[PDB]
From Swiss-Prot, chain A:
Mg(2+) 2 binds at residues 5, 7, 174. Its EC number is 2.7.7.7, 3.1.11.-. SMART domains: POLAc. Belongs to the DNA polymerase type-A family. Mg(2+) 3 binds at residues 410, 589. This is DNA-directed DNA polymerase. GO terms for biological process: DNA synthesis involved in DNA replication; DNA-templated DNA replication; double-strand break repair; viral DNA genome replication. Residues 1-187 are annotated as: 3'-5'exonuclease. One of its GO terms (molecular function) is 3'-5' exonuclease activity. Composed of two subunits. One is encoded by the phage and the other is encoded by the host thioredoxin. Interacts with DNA primase/helicase; this interaction is essential for the coordination of DNA unwinding and nucleotide polymerization on duplex DNA. Interacts with the ssDNA-binding protein. Part of the replicase complex that includes the DNA polymerase, thioredoxin, the primase/helicase and the single-stranded DNA binding protein. Gene3D superfamilies: 3.30.70.370, Ribonuclease H-like superfamily/Ribonuclease H, Taq DNA Polymerase, Chain T, domain 4. Replicates viral genomic DNA. This polymerase possesses two enzymatic activities: DNA synthesis (polymerase) and an exonucleolytic activity that degrades single-stranded DNA in the 3'-5' direction. Non-processive DNA polymerase that achieves processivity by binding to host thioredoxin (TrxA). This interaction increases the rate of dNTP incorporation to yield a processivity of approximately 800 nucleotides (nt) per binding event. Interacts with DNA helicase gp4 to coordinate nucleotide polymerization with unwinding of the DNA.
UniProtKB/Swiss-Prot annotation, chain B:
Signal peptide: none annotated. The record marks 20 as: dTTP/dATP binding. It comes from the Viruses. Belongs to the Teseptimavirus DNA helicase/primase family. The chain holds residues 342 to 411 of 566 of the full protein. ATP-dependent DNA helicase and primase essential for viral DNA replication and recombination. The helicase moves 5' -> 3' on the lagging strand template, unwinding the DNA duplex ahead of the leading strand polymerase at the replication fork and generating ssDNA for both leading and lagging strand synthesis. ATP or dTTP hydrolysis propels each helicase domain to translocate 2 nt per step sequentially along DNA. Mediates strand transfer when a joint molecule is available and participates in recombinational DNA repair through its role in strand exchange. This is DNA helicase/primase. Homohexamer. Assembles as a hexamer onto linear or circular ssDNA in the presence of ATP or dTTP. Present in a mixture of heptamers and hexamers in the absence of DNA. Interacts (via C-terminus) with the viral DNA polymerase that is bound to DNA; this interaction is essential to initiate leading-strand DNA synthesis. The priming complex consists of 2 DNA polymerases and 1 helicase-primase hexamer that assemble on the DNA template. Interacts with the single-stranded DNA-binding protein. The N-terminus zinc finger domain is essential for delivering the primed DNA template to the DNA polymerase. The central core domain contains the primase activity. The C-terminus region is responsible for the helicase activity and binds 1 Mg(2+)-dTTP.
Amino acid sequence: MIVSAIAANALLESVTKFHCGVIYDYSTAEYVSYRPSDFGAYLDALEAEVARGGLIVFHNGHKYDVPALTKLAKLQLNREFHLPRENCIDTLVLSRLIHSNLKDTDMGLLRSGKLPGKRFGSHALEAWGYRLGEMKGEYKDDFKRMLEEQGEEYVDGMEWWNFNEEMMDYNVQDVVVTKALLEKLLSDKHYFPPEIDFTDVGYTTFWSESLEAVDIEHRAAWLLAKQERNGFPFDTKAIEELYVELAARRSELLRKLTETFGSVEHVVFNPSSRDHIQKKLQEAGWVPTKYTDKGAPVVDDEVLEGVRVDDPEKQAAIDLIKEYLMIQKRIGQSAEGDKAWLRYVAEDGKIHGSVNPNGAVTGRATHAFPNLAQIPGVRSPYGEQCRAAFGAEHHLDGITGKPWVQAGIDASGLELRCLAHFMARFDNGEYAHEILNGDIHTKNQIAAELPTRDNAKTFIYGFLYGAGDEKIGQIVGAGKERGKELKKKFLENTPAIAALRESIQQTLVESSQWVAGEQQVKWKRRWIKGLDGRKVHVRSPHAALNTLLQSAGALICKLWIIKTEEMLVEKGLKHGWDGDFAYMAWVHDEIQVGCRTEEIAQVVIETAQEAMRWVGDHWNFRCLLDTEGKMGPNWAICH
Amino acid sequence: LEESVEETAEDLIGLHNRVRLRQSDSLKREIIENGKFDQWFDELFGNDTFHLYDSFAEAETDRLLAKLAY
């Protein structure tokens, strides 16, 4: 096993030259420094560890270093350099896996003055250097301040434009923290058994003697990084053709929304910022019902629908304000935002939405710049146009010239089937078969005694995730009276659910106690074992069920999207826009895959189902898992 | 006679390590391909004491006693 870290000129988008890199070998126990002319020998040293069957240690390498060394080897040395997924490890991913609960713990470390406040939550190398006491100095701050005082300002990352002997030394600095962070993660025996020294083993042994989550996470981070580089094809013109129709609607409404009113001070107010609707409704005679913790009256979509005033003009204007705020939201996400979609469209015509894998307590990843996991759906206004802008048809084939086709496959009722799995231990697969028998929402309706099946649908998820008795009662238009009795009745007709909280409470935990209206829910065990065996720190026993199921559901999907692509590669298909298919977006339980021909998409749909059954078989799931696929051009059709 | 030599060994292997390598199906594929199979195997049969019969193709009486005597 070898440990390394590199230095380039810029980020993955416009990286052109390799500066330096250091490789510490655990067999030689000595560092090796490389320089911009030693780039060729650097690639050889990594291949040697691949030839021996060892491992290559990078921090943020699965997302940056390894694909950059793939990109840099093509334009500088004109050689193909690709590190296999099996013999490369990313400490950054392990950090997000092993120590998802650390800050948290860092509160005392933050109070200590040992850990910078700007690195409060970062799994980055610099954030870890102070934690290990190996930070002798940061190259990010020792350059910026030198730009102010020693002449000539700067804008965004210029400390990498060219090599310097201080960079060569801070490249070493990045390596020794990477080594020490690796050993800090290998010393956690919940994932890495003590009987095996993972610092001196082959790649075949490393994955197998480690916890299953360790293997998945490196497969997951590698896969999702490909999706980011795959990107989501984007019809720029279409969103532009909407900003015109919305800004005109905003401008025409803005003109009309100054026709009803009517305002050391001046006056110009328009529908935005809490001092707007609050200032006019308190002139149309509106008495606020629900307030907030700061004192200000609640002005959300809920209360606005019920705002009734004696003034017909003011009343009819409410619906005009309702439209305005919604117009700004779509505009503020697709055009008028700091993270607007139009700003992230690269030169290829695709949006490369980033994704932080299991760097999210339990399961589903986090998406940003832009958040691909909050594009308005087809059921919301103007969402049909929005979802249509994210489609494989917006990327023509680099060869045939044909518009690619999109395949949308989701996990059918993943949440309740995960629930059926943990409660099949007490009812002997009763609830699990009710899923297969169909209409589980009909049975939950009878079990909880609800008037409509839709009332059962909104009940089962809220109840499972720790909802009050008021909120449950508000489903049928009541309060905690009907709420308490609705939940207690559901528990009596579904014994297994209550018995599930026995096995969980008998795992074991502590005991709780109420003191005069304060929830003092303590606990002894604040970590649930997952399906892959990882620690899921969860929260208080007040809910926890939601975390257990969502951990189950999202970890299933992680293996699901991994096994599908492995089978697609196994079946012979090629991943990448120069191949046959490309992962575009992963949303909780659904994924969007670009496909060169409709025929390829059909195999994808079948393959996705085959992987979902293999996952269910692998972990011996007590309930049956299934998926449904939809073929089409864009996202509005595949969902 | 009613099971291949690998199946009787399979029972012996699990039996030695106080486990059942016939019901835990995820664990079967895991511990074998990881390096715990080779560990137990040398731990058990390494003394060159265990001998089995391999056929399942209906042995004859004096096509068994000959081998049993062997």
